[PDB]
Every structure is written in C-alpha cells, then in structure tokens.
Amino acid sequence: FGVVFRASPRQSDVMIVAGTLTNKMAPALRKVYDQMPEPRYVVSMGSCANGGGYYHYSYSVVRGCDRIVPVDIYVPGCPPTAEALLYGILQLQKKIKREKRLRIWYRR
Amino acid sequence: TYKYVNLREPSMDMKSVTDRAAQTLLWTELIRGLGMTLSYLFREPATINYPFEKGPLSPRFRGEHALRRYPSGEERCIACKLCEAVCPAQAITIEAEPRADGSRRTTRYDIDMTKCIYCGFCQEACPVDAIVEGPNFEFSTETHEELLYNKEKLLNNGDKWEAEIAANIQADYLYR
Amino acid sequence: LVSNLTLNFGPQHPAAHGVLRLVMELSGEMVRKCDPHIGLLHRGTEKLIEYKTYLQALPYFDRLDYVSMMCNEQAYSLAVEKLLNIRPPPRAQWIRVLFGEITRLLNHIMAVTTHALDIGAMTPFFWMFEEREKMFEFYERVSGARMHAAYVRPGGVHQDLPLGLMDDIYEFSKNFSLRIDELEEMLTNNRIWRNRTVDIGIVTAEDALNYGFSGVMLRGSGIQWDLRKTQPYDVYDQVEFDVPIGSRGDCYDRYLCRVEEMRQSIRIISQCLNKMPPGEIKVDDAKVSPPKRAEMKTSMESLIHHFKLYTEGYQVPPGATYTAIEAPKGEFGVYLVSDGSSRPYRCKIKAPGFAHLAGLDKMSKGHMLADVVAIIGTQDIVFGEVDR
Amino acid sequence: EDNKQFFGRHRWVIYTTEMNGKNTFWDVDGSMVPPEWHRWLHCMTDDP
Amino acid sequence: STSVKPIFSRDMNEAKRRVRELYRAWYREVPNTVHLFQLDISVKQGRDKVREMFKKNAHITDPRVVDLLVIKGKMELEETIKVWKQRTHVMRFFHETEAPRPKDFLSKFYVGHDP
Amino acid sequence: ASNLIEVFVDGQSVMVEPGTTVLQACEKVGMQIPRFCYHERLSVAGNCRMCLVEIEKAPKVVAACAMPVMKGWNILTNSEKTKKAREGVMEFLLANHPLDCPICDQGGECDLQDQSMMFGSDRSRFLEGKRAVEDKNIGPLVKTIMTRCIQCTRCIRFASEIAGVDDLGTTGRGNDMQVGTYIEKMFMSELSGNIIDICPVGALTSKPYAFTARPWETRKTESIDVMDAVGSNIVVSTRTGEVMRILPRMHEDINEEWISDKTR
Amino acid sequence: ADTRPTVRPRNDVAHKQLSAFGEYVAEILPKYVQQVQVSCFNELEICIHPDGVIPVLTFLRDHSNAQFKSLADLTAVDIPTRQNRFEIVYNLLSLRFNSRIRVKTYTDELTPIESSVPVYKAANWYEREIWDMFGVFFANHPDLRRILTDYGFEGHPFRKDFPLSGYVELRYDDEVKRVVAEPVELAQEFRKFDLNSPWEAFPAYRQPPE
Amino acid sequence: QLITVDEKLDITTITGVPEEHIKTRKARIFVPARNNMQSGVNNTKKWKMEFDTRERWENPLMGWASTADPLSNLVLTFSTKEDAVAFAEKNGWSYDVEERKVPKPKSKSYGANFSWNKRTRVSTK
Amino acid sequence: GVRTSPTGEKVTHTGQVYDDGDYRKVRFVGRQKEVNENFAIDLIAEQPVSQVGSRVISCDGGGGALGHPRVYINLDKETKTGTCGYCGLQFRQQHH
Amino acid sequence: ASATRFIQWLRNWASGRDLQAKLQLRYQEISKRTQPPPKLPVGPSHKLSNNYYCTRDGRREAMPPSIVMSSQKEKKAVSPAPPIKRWELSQDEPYL
Amino acid sequence: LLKKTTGLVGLAVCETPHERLKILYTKILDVLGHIPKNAAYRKYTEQITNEKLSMVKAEPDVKKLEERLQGGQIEEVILQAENELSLARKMIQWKPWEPLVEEPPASQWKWPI
C-alpha cells in the first residue's frame, strides 16, 4: 500500500502506539511525538492503548494514550488481528482523503 | 538422551584443507546463500489482495460483542449478571429492573470496548446464548467514545449479524 | 570510562519485544559496564492477580511471554491442578503437549528471525513469519483467537479439536523441515553470521548456574539439563527426542541449540499425531471444570455448578507451590500461594528472561558495542515476562 | 472465485460502484460485505 | 522488649550526621539541577523545597526509621545526579497544575463533602 | 458444674451441658453440620434430613438437629458413611427443583446452592420430568415463586411462633404437598419481610428489590436503624453509590436478627 | 497410582526421601532452622531464623549431598496479621540430584536482611525487586535501588495495604508542556466483589476455635 | 549486635501515603456480620479493617460510578483483634474497634414441641 | 411502539430520553442518537398463546441445546396463563 | 503450482532441493471448511451407579504439610534423591 | 585415555585426578578435626568423604571411578571437592552446632491465617 516497514522518528508520518503504556514509559512517548514533523497522525492499537485494556486499574498504567497524545484511529482487540489493523490504516487513508486544507485556506 | 550440535574435528588432509581454502578464497558458501534467495524470486508470493480477499477464519473466531434474540423477537439476555461477574477486565456494566410486563430484563448494558480483552469468557458464561462475540473484526473508530458500546449499540449488531452469528453457533455449538 | 552512553530504544526497531533503556560505559569501543533499566513495561500483573478468581486470572499468563502463549498457560494450569490435587484426562495432556511443542516452534521462529533481524539479516524474517501465520490458524481454529488463546486451563483444555484439524497439522508438519533447511542454508555456514556470533558472549558452566541461567543459556555451556527429560509433567515421558547440547557456550551454539530444538519438535509433533487417544478433554469433575452446555441446560445439579464456577470460582486448598516448565525461553515457573478462597493470595512469576538479563552485564564485559546487540538477542528476551 | 488458487486467494469480491447512496467507485472497504456473504468470503464455511 | 537490630546507626546522634551530610549533598546540587534540567525556577526555590522536605520529618525519633529516609533520600539523590529522572520527574514536588486546595473549614464546607 | 458431660468430635473431647444437641455439640469445636430446616431461633422440625451425621459404633445415622448427645459419644462428622448420607439427601432436593438460578433472586446467596457445592455430588441422573407448582400471592412485598420451595417449614414455623399470625401451613400430602394459605390472603404483618431472609431458597423474595442486583456486587456497610426508637442494627447494602436493600444485623441484646417492614 | 483419573496420583517414594533429607538438615544446622515441613505433594520447606540466611544457603550450595547450585526464584509474601509481616522465600534447584527445596525466613519493615548476593549472584536483581516492591532492605547489597517502579515513585506496591489503583496518574498538560502527575480519579470505580462462600470447604485445614 | 530502641513504633513517613489519606481517613476494625440471607458462619472468622466511604458520582458520559478515593476498595484481613490494631497504630490511621458478637448458646429440645401444659406445644409441622 | 418526545428525541425501550432543558443532548448535535427499534416487549405480545392439554408443560425456547434451560410451567390457574421465565412465551390449558 | 515447466526446474536448481514437492502455499490438501457435526464422548464419571463423589473427590484428599521437625515441640547421610543418571548419546544421530 | 575436554565450558581437563582428589580429600578430612565430634556436620561429612576416598584408591583407571562416584565427569568431582573444603572451613566460625538462636513469635508459620 505504501506503508514501509520501518521509518525513523524524524521521517515518519504516522505513529502506531501498539502495546501498553506504563507511567514510566509515558514521558518518552510524548517526547518522541513532539519530534514528529507535521503532518502527524497517531493510531492507537489494542485495548491497552485505547483505554488501558486488561491493565486498566493498575497503578503503573496510563489509561490510554489519548491521555498523552491526540489519537486519530482506535483499533480494538487484544490484540487486533493483523487484518483488523490493516483496515485501521486503510481507514486513515480515507480520512486523509477528506481533508480540505486548501479550501479552508482559500476561504479565510 | 542428547546430542552434540557442534563437536566436529575437520580432517586436515590436503584435499580437505584445500576445500576450506577453496571456500574462503572464492566465496562458495556466500554464493550458495544467494542461490536460495534467487529461488524465492520465482515463487508465487503469499500475499492476499485485501480487502477484495480475506484471510481465512474459523467459526470460533471472537470479534465484536453482540446481543441475540429468540426466533420470536424477544431478547435473550435476562440480566443474570454472570457475564458481568466473570469478565476479567470488568468491562461489562449491567443494571436491570422488572420490565413493564413483569419480565426480567436489563436497562443498562455497556461493554466498554477499550477494557475488553476479547477473552470470550462472556459467551462461555451466558446460560441463554445472549451475549456472543460476532465474527466482525473491522470496526475501528475515529473517536474513543464510539467504542463505549451501550445496549442500543449491541442489539443493532445482533439485528445486523444474526444472519451469521446464528449460522456459526449451529456449526460449532456441538463442541461446547 | 572514556564516555558513558545512555542507549535508549525509544525508536524501537522492529523487535516486538518491548523497549529497553540501556545505560553503558564505553572505554572507547569496549564496554566496561552495561546497566539495564527495565521497568518501562511494568503493569502490575503480579498485583492485579490478587483481585481475580483463579479462572479470571488465566488470561494474564498469555500476556507475559507473548510469543509462548500456550506454554505459559500450561505452567499456570499445572500449578493449580497440583494445588487442587487433580489429574487431567490423557487426551487433554496430549493436546497440551501437542500445542506446547507447536508454540515452541512459534517462539523459536521469533527468537531466531528477530535476532537475525537486529543484525541486518532481514530476508529470513519474512519466510519464517509466513509459517507462523499458518501456525496461528491452528491457534485460531481451536480457541478462536489468533494469539492469546486461554485454551489451556486448570483441569485440561476448553474445547476439543474441530474435525479435520489434525489433518492440517500433519500437512503443516510434513513440509516444515524443508523450511528450516531454507533457513540454515542462509545463516548456518555463512561466514558473516559466524563472525557476529562465534566466540561472542561466552558463559562458563560454573557461572551460569550461579547466575540463575536456565534453558538454552545452560545447554550452550555444555550442561545437560532439560526439565522435560528430568522432571516430566504431562506425557514427556512418552516421546523420543534428543536434547541439543552446546560446546563452546557462545552465541553460535545457542543459535544451534535453538535451530536444533525446532527440529526436535517436529519429531515430537509427529508422535502426538499418532498417539492421541479418544476421550474427553477436561477433568470429569464438575466442581472444577464447568459442565457441558447441553447438561447445563438440562440438569439442575450441573446448572448450579455452571453458576458458581463462573461467578465465585472454585476454591483451592490452602498451600504454596513452585511449579516450573521448560518454556521455550527458559525455566518459566510460578510460585503461587493460596489461602483457601477463590482468589490466589500471591503469584510470583519466575520469568526466564529476568535471570538472563541480569547476566547481560557479565557477558558484555570486554565486548564491542555492536556485540551488545547480538548478546541481547541470543538470550531471547521479551520484556512482557521480565517486568510483568 | 477460482479453486485452482492457493487457499486464501481462491475467493474474492468486487465491491459495488455504489452503496447506500454513496459513490464507492474507489472508496471500498471491508465492511461492505453483507453478513450472509461475509461468512463465505472468510472461509468460515463452504456453502455460499 | 526494646532491643531491635540496627540498620546503619545506633542512636539519634549517629543518624543526624547522615542527615546533615544529606542536606550538604542536596544543597550543593540544587543549582546544577536547575541548569541541567533547564528548569524554570529560581535556585532559591529549589533549596527552599529541600528544607521543606527535611522539615516535614522533624518529629521522627526512631533511629531505624531515620536511616531509611536517608537511604531513600540518597537513592533519590543518585537518580537526579545521574539524570535518570527527567525534567518531568523533578518538577513533581511542586504541583504546577493542581489547584490550591483551601484549608479553612468554611471554604471546604462550600466545595464538597470532604471531611 | 458437674452437670457437664464429655463427648468426642472426631476423637476430640468437649464439655457440653446435658440436653445439648449433636449439631450444637459440633459447634463448640468449630464444625458446622449442614442444615436446611433448622434455625437456631425456630422450633426444631428435623424434616430436611440434611443434617444426618454418623455416630461411631452405631448402624443408623442420627439427625443432629434434634438428637441429643450422650455421655462419651464419638461424632464422626466426616466419615464416608456421613458423606454418602448428604449427597443422597442433596440429590433428592434437586430432583424436582427448577433450573431457575440464572433468574432467581436468591441466586448467589443460596444455601441450596452453596451446600450443593460443598456437600453434594456434581452430576445428575434424574431422567424423569419435574414437579411444577402454581404460585401464590400473599402480599405486595413477599414475591413467591413456590416452584422453588423445598418444604423446609421455615416460613411456617417463623410465622406461628414469632410473628403470631398462623395463616401459613401445609395443605396436602406427599409430593403434592404445598405451602400457602389455601385461600386468597395477604400475610401482612409488621415483621412480614423477615420470611424472605429465613426461606433458604429463592421461593420468597422481596418484591421491591426483585431483579435489581446480585449479592456479590454489593458493598455491605453496617449501620443503624432510625425508623423507630428500637435502634435495630442493619446492614445497608449499596452498589455503585446507591442503596439497594436493607438486611438485619445480628445483635442478641436488641433485635436478634429480625427487623420490621418499615425498616426493611 | 490408582484408577481414579480425576485425582492426582501420590508419590510416596519422593515423600519419604524428602522427609529423610529434611531431618538431615535440621540436625546439621540447628543454630537457625526453626521448622521443617513437607507438603503432601512432595515439596520440602526449610523455615529458618533470618540470621541463618548466609550459612544455610552456603551449606546448600557446596555440601556434597546438597549441591543446590541454582537459585530458581526469590520473592516475598506480605502478611499483615503477623507481627513480622514480610516473608522471604528461596527456591533452589539441584541439577545433580534433580530435586528442589524451599527456604523461608521472615522480617519486618525496618529490620534489614543479610544480602545473599555472595552465595548466588542470581539474587542480585531479585533482591532489588523485593526492596522495590515491598520495601525490605538488604544489607551489603552491591547496588540497591528501585528497579520496576517509576523514578520518584513513592510506596511499595505489592504491600497488602497499598491500593490497587495507586495514588497518582500521569497525563499531559499543554500549559506546562510536560507530563504531570495528579491525584488519581477514575471514570469508573473498581467493583470489589465478595466472592467468598459462607460455608467451610476443606475440613482438613480447619483451625481450632476460640 | 543489637541496639535498644524504646520509642512508639511508626512508619508513616516510610510508606509514601499522602498525608491527606492518613490524618483524615478513619479505618474501622470489626468482624464482618454474617450475611443474613444465608446460614453459613464461615465469613465471620477473621478480623477485617476497612476505611470509611466517600463520594461516588455519576459519570457525565456513561452514567458509571466514578470516584477519587484510592482506599475505597482496600480491605485487610487479620487473625486477631490485637494484630488488627497494631497494624493501624504503626501506620498512623485513626481507628475504631468493634467487639466480636458471637451468638449466645440456646436450649434446643425437640420434645418441647409437645408439652402437656406449656405453650411450646406446636400446632403444625 | 416508537414515540418521539416533545424534545425531538426518540425514546429507547428502557424509557430514557433527555428532557428539553438538559444539556447533555448536545452530544447528538451533528450526529445521531443510536436506537434499536425492535422493541422486544412488543414482539413478545404478538406471539399467540399455545394451547396444551396437561397441567405441566416444559419450554426451552426451541432448538434444545440452543435455547434457555428447560423449565416446567404449571397451568392450573385458569384465571390467567403460564409464561416462560426466560423466553416469555405464554401457555394456556385448553377449554378447561 | 502454476509455474511453467522451465521455471520449476530453475528454482529447484538454485535452492538445490525439489521445491515442487513441498510447497509453502496450500492448494488442495487443506481440510474442508464445512465439516460434519461431531458426537463427542463423555468422561469416566458419566455413570448411573457406584459413582458417589466422595470416593472420587480430588480436593478433599489434600492435607496440610506434615511437620517433619518443629522447634517449638551411626545414622547415615541421605541426599535429596539418588544422583541423576548420566544421559546417553543419541544413536539416531549422535553428532549433528 | 585422557579426555580431550570435559565438555562443560570453563572446565579444563585435570591430569592427576587421583593425586588431586587424595590431596583435597585428605585436606577435607584434616579440617574436620577442629570441629567437635558431636556436631552432626562432622560425622556426616566424614562418613561420605571416607566412602569417596576409598573409591579413589581402589579403582586404578580414571573412567570407572566416575561410575563409582556418579558425580559426572572427574573434573567436576574435584571442583565439588574444593567446595566441601571451603564449606567445611566456614562452618568453624559460624558454629551451626549451637542451639536455636531464637524462637519466632507464636503464630509466625501458622497458615492459613
């Protein structure tokens, strides 16, 4: 589809937060996010990243990455099937296809 | 029992040594690895053309939770709160009252889908095959709130996938 | 200490084992001290389980070593059965042993392929991960979940194999031995592979035992030890296989113990597709394993049990036990206390990686930086089990 | 469908160029397969 | 009885040496932290907090307990000096975001059922 | 005093006043023989025969709830002769009991349920059909699904001796025996609500509380009653920050374990 | 081994053996050993006074008949009711004799335990976990500090009187451009079930009354 | 070898509990009352320590029951009243104690159901 | 069985609908309030009462192992009918 | 399983094996996705007589540990068990 | 006849196992003198150590001697032998034979609570 397997943080367009997010690991998540050159889209994959999943009530868990970054797509499942995630990506591409960046600019 | 995976003592006869010498100075082994890859270049790749094709599943597959109905139309859930008592992630919230006709039925039934772990214990526990995991696995949303299903969102899945949920159970309930 | 580097895996390369923040000290290029920081994936598993019934707690064990799913479930199940003083039926024990070796194939495929990925050898990853897929389908068709099954359970398994499964499992096993040869043809004799592994990460037999190493981190050092052949649990006293043994105790041997083991599983799977007996698949004691639906929907004595066993759970006699299994990574094991009620009082987990990682500093002394890459991989570390 | 193709690619679909009053000439997605066919296209069963 | 195994010290007199040394350790270090973590507070305030932290445990008199506080204090000090903490962790003694919770009875009676 | 006597529970001596029952003899050593008909505050009836226990060196198991002890008995409370008695008895109770646990209010706090697990067998051989009784209507509080009854004669005894209104009774014989008033009557009494507690099975259940909650999801906050100056002790049971029901709290010096309807 | 498939077949051979090897140790090291018992499913326990942490483990590592080279595991178990709340546990595997044995001790919040790193190097990280998660202090530990918990995290989570959800929760506050820790408030409170049954289950373990 | 310490034991400064949850909370020590809907007394054995209730409020979105009290679900078990208290003091929680209320013995006599001249004579079975 | 409140919001079978003054209903602005319109309490009244010739009749929702647990219903009371606990279907003893 | 005659020889020559025998892709040897209904067996305790639970109750058998030596209350030296017997090489393939 | 390698990495092949064992076994026996006879450690250590010592003398060939000791390769037995000496040394200062140092509180090991 065009989704290369591995891209460095500075060359990336979409972050995929696949897995749990413990408090200790939260600060580095944001630090990486802020370094993403725009436009930047965040995809939350799995139950532990949408809402803290199985470990929702644990003391050392962040209850969803949306507490730490603005998410664009939520892929549910523990874990989502590889095909379920692929649908999530193909969902984003349509979302990027409905933007009106120029039109909005043209009418300011 | 056991066996030594690396205990060889290469023979030091001239032919043997010349082989090792012939290997180093001419990259024979490295070539042999290139042969293997060159074969994969001429095999049909294992790629399925999704979405026009779908990776095979099985009738036991666990997907989006859904609420079923009897053939008549009545609801199957009777607010027995067993699914709520075993859901390991405590993602099921039930609140029931006697219905206007005296029946026992729920009023609140939310399955937070961000705490569910798709374990499948809910349907294993329901004594009336009410809450079942449909086979749908493509319902990723664009906001968090859309994943906080409430009873109205669960039935509609029931009234939307029953044409397949019913078929699967028929296929697999015998193993249960 | 010419200069200290806080090497962090924030930009996690395609490892799928977690992120490790490593604190090091390079005296130029050598490593004079390597310090791992691990807590990044500590979710509190060992404390949540305090609040869960013995059944509700099982899925947590698919989420410690998330490449050895059913193997973990077997360890937890064996511990509980031992506490409950009950014996599963033979057909289940064969299914569990059948899958316990299928998972070992899944795990070793992950270890070798990624370990070869971190060193740039990328192609073998794809070939072998196409075998994992077909191996997931078997996971898929018996439980319904591609990865996390919860299939194995205290008192046996959940459901029986669907008709026609073993025909496929046999078909899969028939072709697999060629796949490995397609792999060894790449890495086994390749000079570059040997350079990155030969005489790297050498561990002496005497030090390994003291440092708590288990599994292939022992057999690489020539020690003859494998819990299956020495303290068998389910049926492993009924299958012919040879335990690979290392000679020089370096990375390359531990790469050959794993590849060799992946063959020895095809030798066990072959046997389990022949000795599988007819019968039921859960202990015929409806106070521990829930009854069949048809009997739940017809008989009162059964209906009650389906009720209590899914709301209160099944009590367990008070007592403590340490149970370990030859999990693919090492000696996975759980020390699990029980106070008599339906909720465990404590569940310590002996993740094999946790011991190995401590030994990382020892093995990286007097090694170049790029060897720390190889050393971590050869230990086969997944940080789900390490931090828990 | 085509039964000479390896298990996984034998059965495929070509989504309609319009559904529920929306142009899907290009914008198809995997949630456009009604449940009845949904079971056959995923090899969950054999009888269409 | 009253006999109990010691940890490090054996009487309040021994302990305070460690405590006093600990203050010496922190006091010399607050300035660098402020520059190191690019913090945005005055070196005066940082040293004020340390005095506040040391002051909240004045009434402690058991020598064993005082040993622990130092051991944790030393550990916490090690993290900062070695920069294992991060600019987020250091600023967590200040509560830059939590609202000022009133202490007077009357205001509490207005907000909520807090006892 | 010298009136005490020595009796043995599984070989262990214990001193008990004369006239004490076996069941009460086993209480003093922490054993608790099962029980359906017996309530320590209700006159002995001894019909459920679920308390049958074996006394060593005797052919016939005695019913603990009624049989007094004798000098120097050895009460085998765990012998295979006692166990088989309980599984047999517990088998009959579930012979015609209905499959109502998933919708039965009592479900989750049911003595027939728990005692079935800890004493009874675990699979059924009853291949016939089941009894099925019509449901009475004895007030706007006590819902009654009498199919679930097990003829334990608690409601009957409690009403006669405690409440003082004897409108309850048994009418018929054999498997068709039934519990009720035999007419269209409301068992209305200031203490009526209690019979919900004593009825060990989910036959009598609170109508207002029906279908609202399960016993395992409620937090029990011991409290006091203020409806009247009797100062009854109660256990407010909340759920998600809302009061769901009220239950008596034992206090021997105030209210034993009953509370009036207004309180309840 | 009896034709009762739904029951675990005992092993009397290994029960007698471990009883023998238990009495054996109780006589060699009577200075510390307080109690030795064997579980009916063939496991051996050596309860000791905390002082004998080094002598007892050193003996089991070197003696000709012990040879317990490998420390399988090392953890703790809190028990509030006991005065000495914590309870350290050592599980040792003897590759020579193909056997296991468990050694248990006790302590409290303040009193420290003698670090057993010198005997087994494996016990280095484990002893930080115990310190990290429970708060027990190990004297002479080469390097002791929190391992699992977060930097600046306060409290010992696996204690019994530490609430499940903890005390603080991180989040990102745009005003201060950093993650910030705030008092924990939950959208849905954890639902504590009362899953026990009011009926004695196992007569064997019945405790004497008052 | 051993030092002599006489003070009153306390660890509140080495547990990490915010002061707001030390001087304000009111731990409660008691033996749970038997659930009156059943007859088994196997839950009034041990001593339980639990803290006072606090505010729970409907969630604006899903109507769930929210809360900001970390100790709401906390419950500790003890074997004796003294051990329960000794845990409260050293943790610095103000506590209340409730005495165990064991049932008083009673005279059960089947024959009393049939008395020639007493009111114990039952009327139905 | 579908009705619209004066607010302009269809009422769910549970009988919950935001009143006119409430603010939460803003959440539906720009979107739609999901509601299932197969009101069960209606589809169960449509089904006719089955006539049987015995005091005690048993229902299991049809399908046997795919229905609710088997129960027995006593039909003596002619002043009303007999209704299944789980599925709600009604029974009456004929012409008695 | 469609590669022309020529290509099949090629990738066989390169890889050296005979790939056309064992194909990494599944074509027809897969099972049928619609299998006939099964009839699973029951366990050994499914009987109607001489099946009393107390005789086959696993949980009640366990006992508290036997206190070998408690502090409150010529002989030979014994190892925990006989030394583990040396393993024997594999006659199937003693060396890789 | 001497092995090319013991097998366990970090274990060099010894040349004089019998002399090396006899010296070590002799030394082990020496240390036990300074341990009171009553101590169970001495009698048990002596009993086994004598059994091993005799087997050293009788068997003249390296190989079968291992099958008598059963301590795996011959080098390991030496390495095991060194430990027993080092263990025997330390026991002197620890004095295990002394009575129980202290008794635990009443309910220390009671379980379940």
Ligand SMILES: CCCCCCCCCCCCCCCCCC(=O)OC[C@H](COP(=O)(O)OCCN)OC(=O)CCCCCCCCCCCCCCCCC
């Ligand atoms: C009578 C007159 C006679 C005159 C002539 C007599 C001499 C002729 C016979 C000798 C010819 C020698 C050819 C010299 C090429 C270099 C070969 C060589 O020696 O490389 C050795 C090198 C490292 O040596 P090593 O394997 O580690 O052995 C241990 C040594 N201590 O190992 C390596 O080479 C590493 C290889 C790195 C590259 C591998 C990746 C690419 C391999 C695939 C490409 C294969 C070549 C393709 C050719 C393309 C042509 C356009």
Ligand code: SF4
């Ligand atoms: S449980 Fe599921 S969501 Fe959570 S980390 Fe594992 S795969 Fe991801």
Ligand code: SF4
């Ligand atoms: S699949 Fe499991 S976790 Fe998810 S809602 Fe059902 S029971 Fe709960």
Ligand code: SF4
């Ligand atoms: S979904 Fe099933 S288990 Fe859950 S409350 Fe409804 S009937 Fe009971």
Ligand code: SF4
């Ligand atoms: S009374 Fe007890 S056994 Fe009968 S239906 Fe209700 S819960 Fe089940």
Ligand code: SF4
């Ligand atoms: S209705 Fe209840 S109290 Fe009355 S006899 Fe039946 S079971 Fe006993």
Ligand code: FES
């Ligand atoms: S309790 Fe004795 S017969 Fe009822």
Ligand SMILES: [K+]
């Ligand atoms: K009742």
Ligand SMILES: [Zn+2]
């Ligand atoms: Zn019905």
